[PDB]
């Protein structure tokens, strides 16, 4: 798998590692989840989320 | 906004509204606790009041946070004389930080590359307390609308474009408000509302101002 298909299954950001593997990544206020694809809050109120 | 629908409390917690001599004359978006992004033509110099956590401007919902603007940074290339609606983006420094919560939350801003990729998804949300009809009064409760991305040629039937795009409609009072794209339940800023007039809508491409935004809105 690579970034050019389905954003490498990365929820937010995808980058190609030096061994033909996807390195998923997230924006400020989020961290990479246990599944190595999804993005979860790293602070109480991260950007761009509805909390209600 | 015309032909949209009523927003839900805390559905667009990055949305803010600008108050001057008249209430709700423009919109904006929360970049961070101390910074707002909006359209340059909304911001004259006069006393601006930013209101976050706003839902209905008539009712006191105990979610609102009013702030004074102490610094206005219109983009260096913006010139009211000449175009007026090109490089149509500004930043507002608030007097006191916003207290972030469920009703007051910033909008995510990706890098130049992904902001554009998100734009090309083809569907973004626009919102504000602009006019409900063409010459109708300003909205009481926050309105939102899903507007599709329009191609180069189709829109050109009317743009500096490089830093602008078309979709749709946004109306008077919505200017400066967010065009937002939702990716897997997280919303990213993909444009600023420039104008609609005939309530396609014309928008500023956020992608080309990301670095400028991040730089000027650095918290220290
Ligand atoms: Ca209110």
UniProtKB/Swiss-Prot annotation, chain A:
Changing residue 24 to F: In HEMB; severe. Transmembrane segments: none annotated. Changing residue 7 to H: In HEMB; uncertain significance; decreased protein abundance; decreased function in blood coagulation. Changing residue 8 to D: In HEMB; severe. Residues 1-40 form the EGF-like domain. Disulfide bonds join 3-14, 10-24, 26-39. Changing residue 47 to W: In HEMB; severe. This is Coagulation factor IXa light chain. It comes from Homo sapiens (Human). The gene is F9. The chain holds residues 132 to 183 of 461 of the full protein.
């Amino acid at each position: 798998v690579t970034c050019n298909i389905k954003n490498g299954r990365c929820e937010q950001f995808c980058k190609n590692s030096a061994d033909n593997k996807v390195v998923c990544s997230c924006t400020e206020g989020y961290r990479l989840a246990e599944n190595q694809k999804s993005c979860e809050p790293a602070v109480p109120f991260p950007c761009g989320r509805v909390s209600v | 906004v015309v032909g949209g629908e009523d927003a839900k409390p805390g559905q667009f917690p990055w949305q803010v509204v600008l108050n001057g001599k008249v209430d709700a004359f423009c919109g904006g978006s929360i970049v961070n606790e101390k910074w707002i992004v909006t359209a340059a033509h909304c911001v004259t110099g006069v006393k601006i009041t930013v209101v976050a956590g706003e839902h209905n401007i008539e009712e006191t919902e105990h979610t609102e946070q009013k702030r004074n603007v102490i610094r206005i940074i219109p983009h260096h290339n913006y010139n009211a004389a000449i175009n007026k609606y090109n490089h149509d983006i500004a930043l507002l420094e608030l007097d006191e930080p916003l207290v972030l919560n469920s009703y007051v939350t910033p909008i995510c801003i990706a890098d130049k590359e992904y902001t554009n990729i998100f734009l090309k998804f083809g569907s973004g949300y626009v919102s504000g307390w602009g006019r409900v009809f063409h010459k109708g009064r300003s909205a009481l409760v926050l309105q939102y609308l899903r507007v599709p991305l329009v191609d180069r040629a189709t829109c050109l039937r009317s743009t500096i474009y490089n830093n602008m795009f078309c979709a749709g409609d946004s109306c008077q009072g919505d200017a400066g408000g967010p065009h937002v794209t939702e990716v897997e339940g997280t919303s990213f800023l993909t444009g600023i509302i420039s104008w609609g007039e005939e309530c396609y809508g014309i928008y500023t491409k956020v992608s080309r101002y990301v670095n400028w935004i991040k730089e000027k809105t650095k918290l220290t």
